[PDB]
Design a protein around this ligand. Sequence first.
Ligand SMILES: CC[C@H]1OC(=O)[C@H](C)[C@@H](O[C@H]2C[C@@](C)(OC)[C@@H](O)[C@H](C)O2)[C@H](C)[C@@H](O[C@@H]2O[C@H](C)C[C@H](N(C)C)[C@H]2O)[C@](C)(O)C[C@@H](C)CN(C)[C@H](C)[C@@H](O)[C@]1(C)O
Ligand SMILES: CC[C@H]1OC(=O)[C@H](C)[C@@H](O[C@H]2C[C@@](C)(OC)[C@@H](O)[C@H](C)O2)[C@H](C)[C@@H](O[C@@H]2O[C@H](C)C[C@H](N(C)C)[C@H]2O)[C@](C)(O)C[C@@H](C)CN(C)[C@H](C)[C@@H](O)[C@]1(C)O
Ligand SMILES: Nc1nc2c(ncn2[C@@H]2O[C@H](COP(=O)(O)OP(=O)(O)O)[C@@H](O)[C@H]2O)c(=O)[nH]1
Ligand SMILES: [Cl-]
Ligand SMILES: [Cl-]
Ligand SMILES: [Mg+2]
Length: 296
Amino acid sequence: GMPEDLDALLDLAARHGLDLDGGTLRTEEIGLDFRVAFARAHDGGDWVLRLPRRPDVLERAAVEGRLLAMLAPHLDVAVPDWRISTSELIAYPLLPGSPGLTVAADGEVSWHVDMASTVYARSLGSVVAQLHAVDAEAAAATGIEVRSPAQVRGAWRQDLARVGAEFEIAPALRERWEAWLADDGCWPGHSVLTHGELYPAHTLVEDERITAVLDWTTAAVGDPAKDLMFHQVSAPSAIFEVALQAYAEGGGRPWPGLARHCTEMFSAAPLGYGLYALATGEAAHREAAAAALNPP
Ligand SMILES: CC[C@H]1OC(=O)[C@H](C)[C@@H](O[C@H]2C[C@@](C)(OC)[C@@H](O)[C@H](C)O2)[C@H](C)[C@@H](O[C@@H]2O[C@H](C)C[C@H](N(C)C)[C@H]2O)[C@](C)(O)C[C@@H](C)CN(C)[C@H](C)[C@@H](O)[C@]1(C)O
Ligand SMILES: CC[C@H]1OC(=O)[C@H](C)[C@@H](O[C@H]2C[C@@](C)(OC)[C@@H](O)[C@H](C)O2)[C@H](C)[C@@H](O[C@@H]2O[C@H](C)C[C@H](N(C)C)[C@H]2O)[C@](C)(O)C[C@@H](C)CN(C)[C@H](C)[C@@H](O)[C@]1(C)O
Ligand SMILES: Nc1nc2c(ncn2[C@@H]2O[C@H](COP(=O)(O)OP(=O)(O)O)[C@@H](O)[C@H]2O)c(=O)[nH]1
Ligand SMILES: [Cl-]
Ligand SMILES: [Cl-]
Ligand SMILES: [Mg+2]
């Protein structure tokens, strides 16, 4: 859709050297931190605009920029190349391929790639191995969050306590999550650079192969499984094994309990809803988290 502040946005982009055809500028997605728009330049190039919605987003954006600068040479998929990156505007050339899925504003999901795909599984395992191979000290120097295996497991234990102090949690869910936290077989023995929100909305594809990976704000050194989780819970087990095999062939070090860890981690999504509601303070979020934490 045509932005209501179209006028100011063209001025903003031109002040940064980007001469856009204002007819082409349309808002694609309004995130919690960035408004994202597509636009074409008069020289024909296609562009993505990231517009920070509040000044408190800027120091995280600066870390992500540092991350992306060190990361890009290490991966055989494209990542956003922030040719403009200021306090007022980030912009990068539009990356090729189609999002594997798209989540509308009304929450409905449109799928472009099917999770039974062996080609997609192999591609995902390969890209995640390459990311996981990135030197974690070099990644930590960008400013991203860093957790050892003990701190990964400690953070989940702390989150269960913080959420349980503010919400009623169904006893069967608490017992499942306590059993998960207690089970050494589930937990990683090493930390790696991770994407942190790796699912098909952020993997562009062509012919079921990943061409680019978007949206690196959540990148951190931490649990390898978090970048395989969405595939584990959405793909048939035999297709997740194709991704695990590609991961291992690329140098990844999966552990036997990893698939189960992914499914226990996904069952704990309500903890994330509770943490999000505690951060926003909004009534609708609190009520959504409350319902998810104590299901019928
Ligand atoms: C660079 C600025 C332009 O933005 C683009 O070019 C996008 C990257 C482009 O996308 C590019 C890139 C690519 C690979 O799609 C991602 C290509 O297939 C299409 C034809 O053009 C979009 C996503 C197209 O694409 C369709 O939007 C769907 C959400 C997905 C669908 N797909 C799954 C079949 C795809 O056809 C679409 C048909 O142009 C959307 C249509 C409603 C018109 N847009 C509002 C305007 C006019 C755009 O021209 C633009 C904003 O000015
Ligand atoms: C459209 C479908 C295809 O997708 C593409 O073509 C991508 C956009 C392509 O990228 C395109 C487009 C372009 C401009 O790179 C962005 C071109 O230089 C290369 C040769 O092909 C990737 C990103 C190239 O990998 C990139 O190679 C650059 C030289 C460096 C870059 N990174 C290290 C900074 C790295 O991610 C690569 C060399 O293809 C990776 C290689 C290991 C795997 N390919 C062989 C696969 C099978 C692809 O053919 C594909 C998935 O079927
Ligand atoms: N085709 C294409 N889509 C993109 C690109 N960058 C972002 N998008 C789309 O815009 C959405 C929002 O971008 P994202 O970086 O995730 O920003 P967020 O709103 O902060 O989550 C993505 O999920 C994709 O649908 C790109 O380079 N190419
Ligand atoms: Cl906004
Ligand atoms: Cl983590
Ligand atoms: Mg995103």
